[PDB]
Design a protein around this ligand. Structure first.
Ligand SMILES: [Zn+2]
Ligand SMILES: [Zn+2]
Length: 214
DNA sequence: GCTGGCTTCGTAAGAAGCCAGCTCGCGGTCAGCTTGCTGACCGCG
């Protein structure tokens, strides 16, 4: 297949009703909208799809920021299904709400970058290969392994200093700030300040960006 | 790559081709009956 064969996810109307959802185990009815995470098979050239009912796919941990470019078959879905996948992708769970806005939904947290206190002491900073001690603050750049596709986005941990040294190769653009790391809000104020200090991004204050109202 | 369910061909009886589906392993932190060791959730990649 020329092109259109490297995407990590696929969406389409069930070609049959024999596929079983990898999350709830129930069968996926033919013609129903289903999604799958593509995986390379070591037994033969070709990728095996792990299918899930549309809703189950998001309850396992799979995440997509831009469906049009990350999910194969997206452009061939009916318009309403293209909007449903686009909105579901934006919604990152978390019981939120709304009241006054202009565009639709809003994103303010990276899905491939996280910050948290080491849940244990067997992890290892992938920048200096030194072990991270339990309790120590660590950062990570989510990445998928072609050898372990069933895992999906796995965290690649680093010490905050080591992470900043490789910000470019890790894809941490200069416009991103520490407040965008997944898990930032759960850090003590002291820990949050240290991060904002090394990853400032644009600015810490907020004056305006289009209108004039303090 | 293999399985399997079924559509296509056949004078009929049974046979074949083919679209569609298809998967964590390991280590050990922190506990517990078993008397000196064992158990396993859950963190890691
Ligand atoms: Zn399901
Ligand atoms: Zn390090």
């Amino acid at each position: 297949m020329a092109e259109s064969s490297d995407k990590l996810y696929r969406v389409e109307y069930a070609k049959s009703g024999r596929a079983s959802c990898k999350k709830c185990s129930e069968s996926i009815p033919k013609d129903s909208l289903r999604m799958a995470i593509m995986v390379q098979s070591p037994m033969f050239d070709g990728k095996v799809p792990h299918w899930y009912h549309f809703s189950c796919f998001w309850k396992v941990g799979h995440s997509i920021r831009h469906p049009d470019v990350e999910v194969d078959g997206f452009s061939e879905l009916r318009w309403d299904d293209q909007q449903k996948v686009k909105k579901t992708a934006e919604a990152g769970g978390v019981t939120g709400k709304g009241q006054d806005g202009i565009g639709s939904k809003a994103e303010k947290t990276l899905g491939d970058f996280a910050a948290e206190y080491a849940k244990s002491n067997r992890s290892t900073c992938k920048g200096c290969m030194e072990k991270i001690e339990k309790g120590q603050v660590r950062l990570s750049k989510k990445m998928v392994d072609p050898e372990k596709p069933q895992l999906g986005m796995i965290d690649r941990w680093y010490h905050p200093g080591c992470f900043v040294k490789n910000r470019e190769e890790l894809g941490f653009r200069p416009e991103y700030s520490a407040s965008q790391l997944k898990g930032f809000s759960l850090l003590a104020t002291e820990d949050k300040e240290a991060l904002k200090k090394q990853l400032p991004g644009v600015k810490s204050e907020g004056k305006r960006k289009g209108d004039e109202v303090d």
